[PDB]
Amino acid sequence: LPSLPLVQGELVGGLTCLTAQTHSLLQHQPLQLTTLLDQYIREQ
């Protein structure tokens, strides 16, 4: 088992994961648009 402090750190990460769930679904639009803008410069 890892040290006790380490397990406590995982709990802090879990809180962020809960919010990330809803954000991840919304995060799909920005990610798609960003990738496209870079590809155009590469083709040029």
Partner: peptide, 29 residues
Amino acid sequence: YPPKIQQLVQDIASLTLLEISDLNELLKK
């Protein structure tokens, strides 16, 4: 996400700037 809750997310998207700021706080973390 069932339709009932998909609608709620759609409503959150079409929100006022002040309320969007409240939503942003959750998104920021």
